[PDB]
Symmetry: D2
Subunit: 345 residues, 4 copies
């Protein structure tokens, strides 16, 4: 069990400070390329490329990194009702073929009705998950070379088929997350890896056992991954110091309110698990803060729960990819990806 | 009036012979890259990247060519009902930003109900054009930074907006074609360049004057482009010889039937305008066959009709991009693209 | 015994015709890149990059192709007296490290006193080979991590050492050729592969047995390679036709004189071994002309002599790399290179 | 007078700490590429690529960065007696042509007899400068398309000529430095820019006026550049703190000895000019330490002396290129390079 270390492409903006354009860094192809090549050479298994109206399209970003990376994988978001499962399967096959089998998919059920309404989607909190199950069903079948005639509540295709096969078999891996029971069931029945948030190890445990169980109910077993922000430094004080530094430009009310929300600094919801990174939405909710060993221990503790993937992030993303790769990778049993050999002609 | 010369990326397959896997050439990223960099260095304005279930997704292909080209533009297809105009506007903005303003869009109203039904689209020959007009309306507004509330027969978005602006102003150029009166009207009212097929100069003339007129009816004037396959050689015999060579593996019945279809070789529907390339669908319908001067004359004759863009192609596409660029470009007034300077940081 | 197929980078110019600027093609980085990536993807083991005042520096050309190729090797020329063996060893180590072990070296003893005098070298036909042996001696030792104190007739270094080791062990392969007895002895004692010209199989045989023998005299066995130009077509007539076409712009006197030089068309010194490509210096002396099978047979016949490498070429070099890779590779047992995995960090 | 900002490629090693392999970072093509593309996108005019047995060859490194950068220039070292001026002119022309005019040359007269003896050079402290003048003379003439017959004390070529011209006119810029009167005279008579070390502004002044004067004595005027290491932070304390941090792993004796060497911390030889970076050889001798304004002021003060180029560096080099580009560039009048347009075909 070697850990698959993932990084993140900040397609909605990057910088040294949370909640401010101060110290921010413009994100263009050039900068995105720097991060991707950094992850590619440092041994990261892949990078998560976010979705949302607030990000540049993840699929195109991923594709524009193909000729400039050789072994890094791209975990791009799949958005159900927003697009036709047939078209998404076709794009999936193309991303996989052009990158020579380095595509990964992460289904994301929309949760912002206003965003969804902007795309032409109008489904209640339930229908959104119903359409997601139907979409995922069709998608997966298409990637398995099947011709699909499907007429469900939300999805309706007739004689849908992909004329080009993907490289990876049966099909490119599919990740999905969510704590709602409905989300856990969708994963437990169709995805390959259930991606959970970074909660204290005990709560993480509970959730895995729940999905592991739901998974079993279908005669299936899935993998697990955790999303964590990382602020690793040489010592624990520099680490915590870097944490305070990160949110130093946040609104005084925000900071004040957070302390009130955490009534039992108040941000450390567990030893070296700081919720200060979640005071602004757009990234991870928690962050492992500490020195190499402490961070590597918290990580190993999660791995011991059955988690083989760790989608990490840091500010700024170019510099911190190096920080983590140099202070953390050496203390862990990191799985090192290989450059796929050219497909025969 | 310098002519904008375009090439084609054969995303559905390439080779030395029509209608056979004999002499064919596998099309992967590597090969697609060869062609794109060849067009980029030879001075082509851009390359058309086809759409259809038979092609690999044009958008991802285009994106994967960004870091490997510097001035070449990508004319990718826009497919209405198949996708949400909001999502397509968002991808359009991202392709334009990542490539630094080198994105071009070519609207394609689907015509194969079976393909469409495979994607989840079920619209008659009319509704297809109605949904196209509504889609194009919304798309264009989105790229102009507008928030769009739209409820038409087919399109329905509420509060749709792009958070990232495209580079090109007002928005990335939009091409569209079609001889049906309904298609000509759509172009005449929303697109920037009307792309016509390569018909004898007289019929091409007529069509341009029709759209030019329809365009005027809206207090608008549009540009014109023509799609032509090219078989230029040092002499006219090598040219015609290369033409015969191209379709030498076609089915005997096909060849026989074509001659019967052309009752007034029979393929030369006009001096040096050979319809032999249209005996198999997937590419251009006609081809300018002849030596440099003859081809350059036929081309100039079309330019004299008001056509400033020429989307060309040849088999194989890598070698023929060089053929055309070396035997033809020197005899024409080719517009040479520039490498956009980096956007300020 | 899989055959290692090599191509050639035309760093002194390329085109469709010999002895004329007519049909020529400007050679810049872009074009050189096209050829290198074409060889890289088509399965060629590597490319020979020529030396001489008439070529752009092979080492820099090779280096500028590193980020744009992944498995292709670069066989660059090593020029003795022109440069310090210490500096050449240091550059050798750097080319090998930056390309991740894809450097190959081909020693070339200068033969043009005027070129040599232009570089500051003034050695008779003998001293040139004496300095070559001394240079090669030092070079090889340096690449084996040795500190070298050497004082010979021509070479004199004291405490020379490379602080960086090459990737390949013992050191990057070293090729050398030449029919003179002195050259055969140098190879037979220091190089890894003796590169011979394409002479009729019988004369090729004789030469190999001579060097194989000289090699044995040192308790060494070396490999063998042959330099051949290739004009392979679908049929033998197109092949011979392409051959005539190639030299159609040569001076009438040249052609006339060649026929006189071959007294026993006159160019075919052996079945399908045409000396027409040697009527202008700068490339290979002979060319295998014929269809796939005939060419593949002539090639296999050479392989049967103990030749495992074939440095090929064709005009133009981009198009013909494809010609050979598609019409010839399928008929042979071609060794397919691998993408080296990243060195550990 | 916009300032040309240069960075440095650490081809002999990079890291977070001076004088230790602790916190060091392996330097390969991948990492070198990261830095070069970072400088290229951040607006740096170019990067200095060091020379010496302790570095990987600068010319090959520079060349391997051509396809991965678009406007950045490469200032590579020229080493006189080590190589033939004819060969160096030929490589110079090739680097300039392949990169499309982005080559810069920095003559370096060797000073380590043991290094020189390792390369085959045995010249006293004088002859080294005599051979440098002769080498530079020939080099420059060769790049101006001249055929050179030269017979001096050390250099001897007959009928030396470059068959390929460089892109830049008259020839690629030539930098040179040195405080010895002999070095100042060589610059004052042949180079385009005299590169001086970062000494207190008053001593820098004096030196410029000396060379400016020597330059005038030849009816010539040259440009000036300064080599400075930079540790810019948000505040002056973080800056000085980062400085102390940098040399925290240095040998206790070294630190102790330095304090003794500076008898009048002791390292601050002038306000915000820290000599702590010179306690280990291999990089710059001094460093501007301070916040944005303080650093930008020290820099402007140097510019006011007639210095238009600033070759900067920082540890680590990838992260600090960003540090300087983000905290410093905004406070200065930085000259922004352009992407050269493709040469006509």
């Amino acid at each position: 069990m070697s850990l698959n270390m993932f990084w993140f492409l900040p397609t909605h903006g990057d910088g040294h400070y949370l909640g401010t354009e101060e110290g921010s860094r413009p994100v263009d192809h050039g900068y995105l390329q720097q991060i991707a090549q950094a992850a590619d050479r440092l041994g990261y298994t892949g990078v998560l490329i976010p979705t949302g109206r607030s990000c540049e399209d993840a699929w195109l970003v991923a594709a524009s990194m193909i000729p400039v990376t050789q072994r890094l994988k791209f975990l791009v978001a799949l958005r159900p009702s927003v697009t036709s499962p047939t078209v998404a399967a076709r794009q999936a096959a193309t991303l996989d073929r052009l990158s020579n089998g380095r595509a990964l998919f992460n289904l994301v059920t929309g949760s912002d009705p206003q965003e969804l309404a902007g795309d032409g989607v109008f489904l209640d909190h339930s229908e959104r998950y119903e359409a997601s199950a139907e979409f995922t069903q069709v998608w997966r079948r298409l990637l398995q070379r099947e011709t699909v005639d499907f007429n469900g509540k939300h999805i309706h295709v007739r004689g849908a088929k992909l004329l080009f096969p993907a490289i990876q078999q049966p099909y490119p891996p599919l990740y999905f997350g969510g704590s709602s029971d409905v989300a856990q069931e969708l994963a437990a029945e169709q995805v390959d890896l259930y991606l959970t948030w970074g909660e204290p190890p005990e709560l993480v445990k509970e959730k895995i056992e729940q999905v592991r169980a739901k998974a079993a109910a279908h005669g299936r077993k899935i993998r697990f991954g955790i999303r964590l922000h990382v602020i690793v430094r040489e010592t624990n004080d520099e680490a915590w110091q870097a944490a305070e530094r990160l949110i130093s430009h946040l609104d005084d009310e925000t900071i004040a309110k957070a302390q009130a929300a955490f009534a039992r600094d108040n941000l450390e919801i567990s030893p070296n698990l700081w919720a200060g990174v979640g005071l602004v939405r757009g990234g991870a909710g928690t962050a492992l803060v500490g020195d190499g060993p402490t961070v590597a221990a918290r990580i190993n503790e999660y791995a011991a729960l059955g988690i083989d993937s760790f989608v990490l992030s840091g500010y700024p993303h170019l510099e911190e990819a190096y920080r983590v790769g140099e202070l953390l990778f050496p203390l862990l049993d990191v799985a090192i990806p290989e450059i796929p050999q050219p497909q025969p002609l």
